[PDB]
Amino acid sequence: MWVFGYGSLIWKVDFPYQDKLVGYITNYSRRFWQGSTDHRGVPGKPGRVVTLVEDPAGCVWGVAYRLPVGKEEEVKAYLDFGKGGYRTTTVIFYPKDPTTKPFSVLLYIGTCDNPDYLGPAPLEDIAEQIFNAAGPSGRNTEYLFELANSIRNLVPEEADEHLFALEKLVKERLEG
Amino acid sequence: MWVFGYGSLIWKVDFPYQDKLVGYITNYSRRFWQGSTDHRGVPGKPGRVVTLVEDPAGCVWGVAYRLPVGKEEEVKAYLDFGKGGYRTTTVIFYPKDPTTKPFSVLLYIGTCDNPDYLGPAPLEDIAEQIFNAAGPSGRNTEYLFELANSIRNLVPEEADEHLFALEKLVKERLEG
């Protein structure tokens, strides 16, 4: 099966994937409304990471990865499509390359119901919080930069108003 | 986290593991009571694969694998310890090497409640069914041989009465 990576997976490429395609999905928008206490932040001082939200006019550029078929032959691992703030569903992924027809992919999403969801907030604020945060995975700012730098390698900044704006405010903070 | 492989994982080594240790666990016994329709058998002509059953006098030799920390920084993947015929729990794993202290490991088990559970049966029968079966993964007999040959590389045949007996009956069938 193929899964869509709208975040860290884009650049955190050290995992096993049979194949990958740059592309985009629809009807969702990428927002930094997901709190991070185990990666780019910690409890008591959470960081912000991305999640996808339903947006009819929405688009999200990212990368689709083909997971290797599982080795354990004794149990049937399953997919639960429902589940406690994290959603699993599928959506159409459009490859950047027109040579490939669009195909279904798995989407793993953290909902408004997940415990870590921080929700929408003024960008001024999100940027600062990101500025300050650091977690087991690294600093919050590095996460944003990679993503942003990461997306730019694939599309014009117009593609993600929210992400690039954030990057810019942060860079400004880094100034003063 | 570390997971215990009592089956195919022992020899199907083409996956990513940070580390591995030969060892054994207790209070469970390995039996060929699990039906296979997606690996070593198919619907309408199922094969047999191993599952672990609670056995107070029981022991299971196998290998423990250290899974790599997950790359996705956006969602919290969880462990559900309860779940529809497959159980997830932990048990003590004793390394063959005394230099290492015993440690907890994850055990993923298919219960009597799973749909594919075929249950106990006369060994004469299981061997034949295995003889005949083939699935997406390969023939049923190859699965048994690898396991058996696989275990022997780690312990005397006395360790697994059930597995080696089965191997032998099968080899006999292969004769006539």
Residue numbers in the entry:
A (entry chain A), B (entry chain A): 1 to 82, 84 to 177
Paste lines from the article.
After several rounds of iterative model building and refinement of the SeMet-derivatized ChaC2 structure, unexpected electron densities were found adjacent to the suggested active site cavity. With the native ChaC2 crystal structure at a higher resolution (2.3 Å), we were able to finally determine that these electron densities came from the loop region (residues Val60–Asp80) of the adjacent ChaC2 molecule. There were three ChaC2 molecules in an asymmetric unit (ASU). The ChaC2 structure exhibited a mixed α/β topology with nine β-strands (β1–β9), three α-helices (α1–α3), and two 310-helices (η1 and η2). The ChaC2 structure exhibited a unique flexible conformation with loop2 (residues Val60–Asp80), flipping out from the core domain. In each ChaC2 molecule in ASU, the long flexible loop2 protruded from the center crystallographic trimer and formed an unprecedented dimer with the adjacent ChaC2 molecule, which we call an open conformation. Analysis of the oligomeric state of the ChaC2 structures using PISA web server also indicated the formation of a stable homodimer with a relatively large buried area of 1349.4 Å2, covering 13.1% of the ChaC2 monomer surface area. Furthermore, Lys12 and Arg40 from one ChaC2 monomer formed salt bridges with the side chain of Glu73 from the other ChaC2 monomer. When the structure of the crystallographic ChaC2 dimer with flexible loop2 was superimposed with the structurally similar enzymes, the Glu74 residue in loop2 of ChaC2 was found to be located at the dimer interface and structurally equi-positional to other active-site Glu residues in the structurally similar enzymes. However, ChaC2 adopted a unique quaternary structure wherein two ChaC2 monomers exchanged their loop1 and loop2 structures, resulting in a more flexible and open active site cavity.
Recently, two isoform enzymes, ChaC1 and ChaC2, belonging to the γ-glutamylcyclotransferase (GGCT) family have drawn attention due to their ability to cleave the γ-glutamyl group of glutathione, resulting in 5-l-oxoproline and cysteinyl-glycine (Cys-Gly), specifically in the cytosol. ChaC2 exhibits a 10- to 20-fold lower catalytic efficiency than ChaC1 and is constitutively expressed and involved in the “housekeeping” GSH metabolism. Despite their low sequence identities, GGCT-fold enzymes exhibit a similar structural fold for their catalysis, including a YGSL motif and a typical catalytic Glu residue, as well as unique features, especially in the vicinity of the active site, which specifies the substrate repertoire.
